Design a protein around this ligand. Structure first.
Ligand code: HEM
Ligand SMILES: *[C@@H]1O[C@H](CO)[C@@H](O[C@@H]2O[C@H](CO)[C@@H](O[C@@H]3O[C@H](CO)[C@@H](O)[C@H](O)[C@@H]3O)[C@H](O)[C@H]2NC(C)=O)[C@H](O)[C@H]1NC(C)=O
Ligand SMILES: *[C@@H]1O[C@H](CO)[C@@H](O[C@@H]2O[C@H](CO)[C@@H](O)[C@H](O)[C@H]2NC(C)=O)[C@H](O)[C@H]1NC(C)=O
Ligand SMILES: *[C@H]1O[C@H](CO)[C@@H](O)[C@H](O)[C@@H]1O[C@H]1O[C@H](CO)[C@@H](O)[C@H](O)[C@@H]1O
Ligand code: NAG
Ligand code: MAN
Ligand code: MAN
Ligand code: MAN
Ligand code: MAN
Ligand code: MAN
Ligand code: MAN
Ligand code: MAN
Ligand code: MAN
Ligand code: MAN
Ligand code: MAN
Ligand code: MN
Length: 299
């Protein structure tokens, strides 16, 4: 928000306004990075981004400590080298390359379509990067009629998403990605769980309106009483939440689930790609921005 608005005070004392991305701006498959870029906490054009830029942006404007993004930074730069063909040093070329499929970007996302979702031909691909309202609605419908959801609910959501993706993706494309997705499940609990409840650290409950605002608008739900977590969330919270999601009991099992879908997931680790492997072509779509309604500087 505008620095003088005081909307972030006293959790964020140095805010910048929301600015919608233009047609030439680079955006990510990540709702967090997109929100940061929309506010210029990382470059608004989504290009040439250093580790420290990202660390400071997450810590000072989102209440997310350095520990939370340590692996994410490692993987971002691995994907950058893979996509571009050369070492990206400490300048991430752009955000768009992060939508390289079967890498950091993965299938059965909460709010994005899959790279080969519903395509009639093997070589075809679609926008697996921009926010997709229809996809996100499939996630929200699992918790329809609710204001909050827990670990068990999140587990049901990711299962529903896995089921839908396995059915809709071109035969052979679907690849389960529990370790990455459920770090991201942990991310959701870290950012938009209801810290106003007395037991937030034992059984954090996500506020659905906060989640919906963040994802749909790619800006921060301050108007709904949200603020950056204080103290900043640490990696321990995230991986514990991740483990708790996958450990939660399933009361409704979707069909067409991949093998081993229900149960614990592997620890997320650094990505690696063969030097001979050519990257998949990136979707070229203009960056998404909210239009119903469009957002003002303080939204
Ligand atoms: C530099 C650090 C980060 C990088 C490089 C990064 C990168 C990515 C990428 C490539 C995806 C796409 C995966 C997919 O859904 O197919 C993604 C998704 C996601 N990111 Fe990040 N991320 C970072 C930090 C964060 C943080 C700190 C949060 C929140 C605390 C966050 C929230 C999310 C969520 C919730 C998704 C899932 C979106 C969905 O499934 O629709 N990210 N991120
Ligand atoms: C973000 O950065 C990535 C990585 O540099 C960009 O993707 C790449 O964009 C270039 C065009 O600037 C593509 O190069 C072209 O390749 C085709 C086919 O090989 C060739 O006919 C052209 O002569 C040109 O060399 C490249 O394919 C593409 N990489 C991938 C894997 O898709 C991306 O455009 C950037 N996005 C934004 C919004 O800045
Ligand atoms: C995206 O952001 C917009 C702008 O903040 C939200 O629309 C506002 O919703 C709040 C509810 O707290 C109201 O006070 C305002 O009257 C709304 N403004 C306008 C112009 O509609 C919108 O709800 C957000 N989207 C989601 C899905 O959360
Ligand atoms: C991205 O651009 C490519 C051409 O540069 C196309 O081959 C792709 O289909 C894709 O096009 C989509 O996004 C662009 C924005 O760059 C739009 O102009 C197209 O209408 C399409 O949605
Ligand atoms: C914001 O400023 C107030 C008043 O000086 C201060 O008490 C608070 O600690 C500041 N917040 C942060 C996160 O620095
Ligand atoms: C989130 O983190 C937990 C603990 O590392 C994993 O078990 C899960 O697969 C996901 O990566
Ligand atoms: C989440 O998981 C990690 C290991 O993946 C632990 O280090 C952390 O304490 C938390 O249990
Ligand atoms: C790890 O941390 C999470 C979040 O604080 C808890 O919900 C979980 O029970 C475990 O202690
Ligand atoms: C990962 O961590 C969670 C929360 O502590 C457990 O529920 C799970 O069994 C696994 O150890
Ligand atoms: C986890 O617990 C539920 C009860 O809520 C059962 O339905 C399920 O079989 C599993 O034991
Ligand atoms: C068991 O409970 C879950 C909530 O965790 C529901 O999603 C499901 O429909 C069933 O009632
Ligand atoms: C749906 O069915 C699976 C087994 O296929 C269970 O693990 C789950 O608890 C739910 O009842
Ligand atoms: C229970 O919930 C699962 C996942 O949301 C559905 O796939 C199933 O149809 C039932 O409603
Ligand atoms: C990481 O691991 C892969 C193997 O999957 C190698 O191809 C790469 O060179 C790096 O060592
Ligand atoms: C987004 O842009 C529209 C104009 O199309 C405005 O009505 C709105 O206030 C927001 O700035
Ligand atoms: Mn995805």
């Amino acid at each position: 928000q505008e620095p003088g608005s005081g909307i972030g005070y006293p959790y964020d004392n140095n805010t910048l306004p929301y600015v919608a991305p233009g047609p030439t701006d680079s955006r990510a498959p990540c709702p967090a990075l997109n929100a940061l870029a929309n506010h210029g906490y990382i470059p608004h054009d989504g290009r040439a981004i250093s580790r420290e830029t990202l660390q400071n942006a997450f810590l000072n404007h989102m209440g997310i400590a350095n520990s939370v993004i340590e692996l994410a930074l490692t993987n971002a730069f691995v994907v950058c080298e893979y996509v571009t063909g050369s070492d990206c040093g400490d300048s991430l070329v752009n955000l768009t390359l992060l939508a390289e499929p079967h890498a950091f970007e993965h299938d059965h996302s909460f709010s994005r379509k899959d790279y080969k979702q519903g395509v009639a031909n093997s070589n075809d691909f679609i926008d697996n990067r921009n926010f997709d309202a229809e996809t996100f609605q499939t996630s929200l419908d699992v918790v329809a009629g609710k204001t909050h959801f827990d670990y068990a609910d999140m587990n049901e959501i990711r299962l529903q998403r896995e089921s839908l993706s396995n059915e809709l993706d071109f035969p052979g494309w679907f690849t389960e990605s529990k370790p990455i997705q459920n770090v991201e499940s942990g991310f959701i609990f870290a950012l938009v769980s209801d810290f106003n409840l007395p037991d937030n650290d034992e059984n954090p409950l996500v506020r659905i309106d906060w989640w919906k605002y963040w994802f749909t608008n790619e800006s921060f739900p301050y108007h709904l009483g949200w603020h950056p977590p204080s103290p900043a969330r640490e990696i321990e919270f995230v991986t514990s939440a991740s483990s708790a999601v996958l450990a939660a009991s399933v009361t409704s099992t979707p069909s067409s689930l991949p093998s081993g879908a229900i149960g614990p997931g592997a620890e997320a680790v650094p990505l690696s790609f063969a030097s001979t492997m050519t990257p998949f072509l990136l979707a070229t779509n203009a960056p998404y921005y909210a239009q119903d309604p469009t957002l003002g500087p303080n939204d």
